[PDB]
Amino acid sequence: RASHHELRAMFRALLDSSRCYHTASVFDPMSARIAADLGFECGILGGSVASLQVLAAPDFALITLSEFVEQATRIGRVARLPVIADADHGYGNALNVMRTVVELERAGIAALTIEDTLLPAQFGRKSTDLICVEEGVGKIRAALEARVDPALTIIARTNAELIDVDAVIQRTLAYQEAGADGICLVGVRDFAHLEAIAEHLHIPLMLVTYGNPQLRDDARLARLGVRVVVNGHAAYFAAIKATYDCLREERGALTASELSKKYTFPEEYQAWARDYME
Amino acid sequence: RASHHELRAMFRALLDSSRCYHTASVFDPMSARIAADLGFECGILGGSVASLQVLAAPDFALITLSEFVEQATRIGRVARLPVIADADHGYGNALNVMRTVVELERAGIAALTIEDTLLPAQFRSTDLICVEEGVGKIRAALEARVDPALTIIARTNAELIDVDAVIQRTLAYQEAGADGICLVGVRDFAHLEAIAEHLHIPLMLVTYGNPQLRDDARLARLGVRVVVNGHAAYFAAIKATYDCLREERGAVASDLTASELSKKYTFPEEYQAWARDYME
Amino acid sequence: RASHHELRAMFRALLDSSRCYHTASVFDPMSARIAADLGFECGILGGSVASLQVLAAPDFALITLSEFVEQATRIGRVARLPVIADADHGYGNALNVMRTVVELERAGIAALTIEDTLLPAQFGRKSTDLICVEEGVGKIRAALEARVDPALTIIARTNAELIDVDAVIQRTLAYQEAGADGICLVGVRDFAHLEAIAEHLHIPLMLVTYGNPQLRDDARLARLGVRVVVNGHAAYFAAIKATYDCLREERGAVASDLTASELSKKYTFPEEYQAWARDYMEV
Amino acid sequence: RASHHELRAMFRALLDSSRCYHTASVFDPMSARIAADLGFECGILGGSVASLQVLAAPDFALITLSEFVEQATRIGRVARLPVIADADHGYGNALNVMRTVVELERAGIAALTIEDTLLPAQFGRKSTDLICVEEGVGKIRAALEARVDPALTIIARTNAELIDVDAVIQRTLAYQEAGADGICLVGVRDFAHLEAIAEHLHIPLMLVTYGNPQLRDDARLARLGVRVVVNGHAAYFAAIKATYDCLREERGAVASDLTASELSKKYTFPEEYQAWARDYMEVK
Ligand SMILES: O=C([O-])C(=O)[O-]
């Protein structure tokens, strides 16, 4: 019964509240139904999980925009809670970002992130790098132009592990001024790190913590402007382990995250990158 | 490194052997990779698991042929064991059948089954199309084939119709040139034995863990090469996802089995309500 | 600028005018942009043409719902005029009909037709018959239930050619009863025929005439309640002929004397599909 | 009748002959059926034409690999002549190239081109810049590794317009050494330009000429190793103009003055895409 637009209103309501919320990992229609049934307030479609499902591949931007959108569209037919799409770098330059936004808003997603990582991996650079802030600003501005339903939330994402706090403040302030509805940060260490970045932000914050034990004080998160916390996709690795255990028993022939990692053939992709990209 | 054609050769080799093999449930790339790691000889992409994956929907012919093919294509990019696709009734009449063969063969599947169930549910029951129509769908499938190593398997339902009629159909399909026969609903080694008698092509059983059919040396002797135990591996995954999120939430979780859980999130009463409302 | 919802308001606003409208054939992004630039009020995405573009195939329900929705989706990204999708039989029973509406409404189309033709062609029966009126009413009800944006127009279509006029009036009334926003008619012979049918409908009418000279009168049509007229897909066949003639001239080959419709039919390989239908679908 | 594999052998036999062949523009199943009926030896699916068909958009790498592949798949269900796919840069880095080859091969294409253009366009940087030759070699070697059917023809494409002859010579030799099956060249000026680049190649050449009148001589081209000429995608433009002409006369509008190509460009909304590039991809 909630439409794509109504789901966007619900998400905005979470953001205007004075609490933060932990996302359920929602990657397909079954998991979306599960999350809603357990009473989760919002979910997240991760780019990493889409890449496991479509391709059994590492999180290397191998999936195409169409493939990511098919995943989102399948979730959008059944989702009764608002779903955030991790939309990587927008699948190209700022013109590709427009299309990312059109496709995902139509798929029925409640909110999406665009991040300023230089993707896909560059020739010879075994470093993960960020695009210049000027490019990043144009991508956020491009995303906001492409939006049709103004209830859609556009979250600018950056990586605070890569760069120093003063560059994170600079970029995130620039994205706020560009019109971002929220700021998403990955790589934040602890509360001192967070307070330094949160100080000059007045739009809601989204945190990708991957179960960081030094960011478990939710009351403190919320009063620093954090509304959404993402801990990762254990629920997907648990499904992979279950499938394996069942088949292994049927046959008579590693943790869950190690098992999921193994089936991405990381060594094969690592050999290709060495042989063709360095 | 094995091509789509080589996997067809490997599957034919199993059918020519003296043994019968038990499929792994293979519904996506991760599962295809797990099945091969575990040493399975062949895999099976069931229409019902595609329906849960794409739609969280019951096994009601709701997925389009393109969706079903998308699932098969994703598998074909990684599969190192031959995989059988359950292709339902071939997604329409005999001319639609030719498209399903073309689509699934290109996606890289090793064998497919075409069943004579009248799908989708007619405005009735689980009926069967006439034997003449079924023969013509099989001849059409075999025509549509390009790679001759591709195995075309003709499927019928034995649970309902009397064994004469099953003997009747399956003989006609054998006559029409099918590479093998797929049987669902066989009761026991006696019932198998009857249908098996006048057949010289490989047999495939969808038993669903039927306890009365567990002798592999004996199924083989009778001409069975492939046994499909079901899709518990898929339910395990749903349960596991549910359990992890339920723990994360601090909610207090069901006492449903992996299968009752899977069925629940298929919303079967909505679909049952719509059928009663719009198709009665 | 105009959103999928605003296009639906425009289409509703046409159906509530006292005027008749002639569709442009809108089959892809470029044709949609052409048709808007020319001032057309609405377009139609025909299933026959989707089948030409996707498959080079006759109009035999060979294309999948997904393929058809992909065509609608492409159009939806550019369309500044409202577009009607010919959704054939809803790609299955009433359960499939519901998916058909969900998919096409999400694609962005302003209106869609569900017809009561028995599809795909069934075994033995060399003619193409209609589902019983009750399966028809169940289909139409399921379509309306599946709709989310109430501004989406759901149109019930039937064939006024084979079955006698009374059987027709019966079907249309039941559809109108069932809650259809409009009726679509194929194979109306003439105004005598139309008037019989128009008489006890009060919901907007749409006509697929195929150029029928007996129905050429717009003021009259509108007074009878017709709001949309589909003349066909000549603009697609013109594209086929232009591609043929350009390549023929680059090659240095002799001219063909087939017309644009003739060339388009030829490239569907109709004889091949016929041999298969005789070989595999007749006793 | 001809399988995807059989089509590749037919393509290879063109390459092995002593003649140059002119592609038909083949962008969907009806056009593939037309080209075959007319007796064309081979066809070409242009990425530019895919962008017009899927998006009504200019050739700006806006189409996804999945969209390109769907176009190529439609064609592959009916093609009776070998079709070359213009695969742009492989839709990302060398690892994306692998997937490009996988998808188009399975689609049933006879041959594909991978170009060393830096794509998509860079924030301010320059839309026609090339990647370094080392990255180009890695992309070519990745395509060749990704190939399953050995009959598939893999062509390394470069742009001779803006870089110097010695640089084209360097890149083409290195793609030849990397094992490319052919070399495709866009932006060749004339026979002297061509002769310099052709001189140290021994694999078949493909030329994208865009009607360049300084390169019209089949015998003379074939003697330099040219096997395939792509003259452009006029046949698509003609199909657009025909649709325009038909609806406009249906409407009662005045006849258009614009050529087929002018009218096709108009409906890509070039000014809109240009304004967006200005506003979002240039320093403020
Ligand atoms: O890709 C992911 O899973 C993410 O960034 O959350």
Ligand SMILES: O=C([O-])C(=O)[O-]
């Ligand atoms: O649908 C299924 O899962 C089957 O028949 O194996």
Ligand SMILES: O=C([O-])C(=O)[O-]
């Ligand atoms: O398919 C068509 O073109 C129609 O029914 O209008």
Ligand SMILES: O=C([O-])C(=O)[O-]
């Ligand atoms: O894109 C094109 O049309 C080409 O590169 O030939």
Ligand SMILES: [Mg+2]
């Ligand atoms: Mg991610």
Ligand SMILES: [Mg+2]
């Ligand atoms: Mg099944």
Ligand SMILES: [Mg+2]
């Ligand atoms: Mg139609």
Ligand SMILES: [Mg+2]
């Ligand atoms: Mg190109």
